Design a protein around this ligand. Structure first.
Ligand SMILES: Nc1nc2c(ncn2[C@@H]2O[C@H](COP(=O)(O)OP(=O)(O)NP(=O)(O)O)[C@@H](O)[C@H]2O)c(=O)[nH]1
Ligand SMILES: [Ca+2]
Ligand SMILES: [Mg+2]
Length: 164
């Protein structure tokens, strides 16, 4: 069937692994031993259509391996956490690097603000909505913990790949 290659990127500790596992296994894991991090495949139904998601959950930081997953990846979730200002400031660098390897300022992407279940917010929604608008991509707030917005974020990325 149709297979969509999705890649999850962003700074250390924003929730890349928890987000991926929440989508794949429908629960919240508190910690991961990066015995690779790596790749998962899932059959899902999106807009009536059944299809295959191949999701790579990346490390925060081999240049050729990084460039390699950026080049083969079809869509990207760019994750920060709403309680970590530094993670939001790093977003620019992840997006720039993807655009530079793919040779396109039109790569399918969704800006993800994770940990929205938390009280100690340091990044306002309006700031992140502005950044996303500046890139011309959607913004979605998520919580891997409560599952808020998780399906929306991944499913929106797939649609962005189709609408490309
Ligand atoms: N409150 C809350 N905590 C979360 C959420 N998502 C992840 N966490 C917690 O935040 C920490 C980071 O999660 P993790 O998935 O390991 O992050 P990561 O981005 O994969 N880190 P790394 O880049 O080092 O692989 C973990 O302690 C996890 O339990 C969320 O939505 N809400
Ligand atoms: Ca280039
Ligand atoms: Mg991880």
């Amino acid at each position: 069937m149709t297979e969509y290659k999705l890649v999850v990127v962003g700074a250390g500790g924003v929730g890349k692994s928890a987000l991926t596992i929440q989508l794949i296994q429908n629960h919240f894991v508190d910690e991961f031993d990066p015995t690779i991090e790596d790749s998962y495949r899932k059959q899902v139904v999106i807009d009536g259509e059944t299809c295959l998601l191949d999701i790579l959950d990346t490390a925060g930081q081999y240049s050729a391996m990084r460039d390699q997953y950026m080049r083969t990846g079809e869509g990207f979730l760019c994750v920060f956490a709403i309680n970590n200002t530094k993670s939001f400031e790093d977003i620019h660098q992840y997006r720039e690097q993807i655009k530079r390897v793919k040779d396109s300022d039109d790569v399918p992407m969704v800006l993800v603000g994770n940990k929205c279940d938390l009280a100690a917010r340091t990044v306002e929604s309006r700031q992140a909505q502005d950044l996303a608008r500046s890139y011309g991509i959607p913004y979605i707030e998520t919580s891997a913990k409560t599952r808020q917005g998780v399906e929306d974020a991944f499913y929106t990325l797939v649609r962005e790949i189709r609408q490309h």
